[PDB]
Short mmCIF file of C-alpha atoms in Angstrom, two decimals:
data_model
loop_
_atom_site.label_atom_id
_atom_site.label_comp_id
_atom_site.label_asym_id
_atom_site.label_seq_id
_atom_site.Cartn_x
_atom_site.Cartn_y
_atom_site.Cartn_z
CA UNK A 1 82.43 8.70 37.57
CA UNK A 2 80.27 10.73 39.73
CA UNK A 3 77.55 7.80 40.90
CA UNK A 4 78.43 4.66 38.86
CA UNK A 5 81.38 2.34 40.00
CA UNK A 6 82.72 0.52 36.97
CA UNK A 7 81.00 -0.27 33.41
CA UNK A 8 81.29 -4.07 33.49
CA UNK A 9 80.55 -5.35 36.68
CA UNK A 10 77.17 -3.41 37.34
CA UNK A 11 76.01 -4.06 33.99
CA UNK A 12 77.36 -7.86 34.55
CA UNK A 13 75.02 -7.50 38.23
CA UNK A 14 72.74 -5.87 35.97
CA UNK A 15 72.19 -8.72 33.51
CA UNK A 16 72.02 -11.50 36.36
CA UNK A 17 68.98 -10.12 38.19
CA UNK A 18 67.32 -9.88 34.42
CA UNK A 19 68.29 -13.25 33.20
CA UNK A 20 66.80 -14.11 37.14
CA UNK A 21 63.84 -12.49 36.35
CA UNK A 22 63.61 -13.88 32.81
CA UNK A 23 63.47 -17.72 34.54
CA UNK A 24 61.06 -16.64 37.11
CA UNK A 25 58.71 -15.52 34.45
CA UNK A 26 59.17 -17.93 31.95
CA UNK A 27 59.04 -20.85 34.10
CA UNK A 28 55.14 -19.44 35.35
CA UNK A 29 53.99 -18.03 32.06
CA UNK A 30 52.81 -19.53 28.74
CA UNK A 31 56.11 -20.29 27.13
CA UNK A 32 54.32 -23.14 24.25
CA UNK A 33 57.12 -25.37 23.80
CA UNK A 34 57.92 -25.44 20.20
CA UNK A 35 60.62 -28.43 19.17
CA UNK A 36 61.97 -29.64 15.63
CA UNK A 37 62.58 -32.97 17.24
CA UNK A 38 60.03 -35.28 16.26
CA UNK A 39 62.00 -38.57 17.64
CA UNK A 40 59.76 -41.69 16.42
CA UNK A 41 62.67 -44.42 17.33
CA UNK A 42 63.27 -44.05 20.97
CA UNK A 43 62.95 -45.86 24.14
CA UNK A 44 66.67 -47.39 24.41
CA UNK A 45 67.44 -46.23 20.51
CA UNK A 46 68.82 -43.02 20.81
CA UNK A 47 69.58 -41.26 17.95
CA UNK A 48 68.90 -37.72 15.39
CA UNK A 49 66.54 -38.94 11.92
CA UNK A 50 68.43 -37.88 9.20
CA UNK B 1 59.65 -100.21 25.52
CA UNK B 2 61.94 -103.33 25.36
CA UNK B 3 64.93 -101.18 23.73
CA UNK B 4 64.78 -97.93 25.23
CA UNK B 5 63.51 -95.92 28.21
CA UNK B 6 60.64 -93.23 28.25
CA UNK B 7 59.41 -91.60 24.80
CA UNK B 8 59.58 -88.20 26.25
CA UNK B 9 63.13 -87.64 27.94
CA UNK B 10 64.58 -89.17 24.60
CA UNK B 11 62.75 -87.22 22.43
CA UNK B 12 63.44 -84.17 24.88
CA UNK B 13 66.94 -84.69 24.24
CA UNK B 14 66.18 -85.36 20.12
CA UNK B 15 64.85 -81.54 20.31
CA UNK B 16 67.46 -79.90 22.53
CA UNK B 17 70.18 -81.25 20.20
CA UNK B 18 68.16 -80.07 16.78
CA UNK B 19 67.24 -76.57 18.25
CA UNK B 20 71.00 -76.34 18.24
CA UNK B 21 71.92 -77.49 14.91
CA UNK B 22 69.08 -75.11 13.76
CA UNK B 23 70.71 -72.07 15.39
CA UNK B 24 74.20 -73.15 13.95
CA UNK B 25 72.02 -73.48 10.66
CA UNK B 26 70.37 -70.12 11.14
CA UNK B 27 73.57 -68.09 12.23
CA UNK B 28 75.42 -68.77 8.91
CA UNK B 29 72.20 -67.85 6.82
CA UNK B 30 71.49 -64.52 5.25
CA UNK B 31 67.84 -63.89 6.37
CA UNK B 32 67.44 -59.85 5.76
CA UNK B 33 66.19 -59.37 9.44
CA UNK B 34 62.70 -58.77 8.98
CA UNK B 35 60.88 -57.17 11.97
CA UNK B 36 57.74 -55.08 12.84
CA UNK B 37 59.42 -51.41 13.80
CA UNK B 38 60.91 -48.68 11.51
CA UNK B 39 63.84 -47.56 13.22
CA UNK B 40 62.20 -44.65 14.96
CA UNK B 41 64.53 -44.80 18.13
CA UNK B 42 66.57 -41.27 18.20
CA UNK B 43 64.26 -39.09 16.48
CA UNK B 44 61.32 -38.66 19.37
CA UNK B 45 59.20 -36.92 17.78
CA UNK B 46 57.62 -39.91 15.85
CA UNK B 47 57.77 -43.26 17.09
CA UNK B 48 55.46 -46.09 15.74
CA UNK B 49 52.27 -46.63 17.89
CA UNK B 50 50.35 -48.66 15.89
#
């Protein structure tokens, strides 16, 4: 090429400092948790309803 | 008493020995554990609060 290096480790770069970013927002954002787990029989009895 | 010592120690004794014999009893029953909870350990997204 004329400006890029390689295909795979820039876009590999690429997708760490989004996946970074993704975190930073998500963690300080309104991400509702939203869970299918509605465990009724915990507290020392773990396990998954049927 | 003119044929034994103190009516507490003795019957102390009396109930140590039958709380045995009751467990031996009880151990080769078939009670269908009855109890209070509903098996609500794993799943913990519903756990009886009542």
């Amino acid at each position: 090429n004329y400006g890029r290096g390689r295909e795979l480790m820039y876009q590999l770069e690429k997708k760490g400092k989004e996946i970074k970013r993704d975190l930073e927002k998500i963690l300080l954002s309104g991400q509702a948790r939203t869970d299918v787990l509605a465990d009724q029989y915990l507290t020392n009895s773990a396990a998954d309803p049927a």
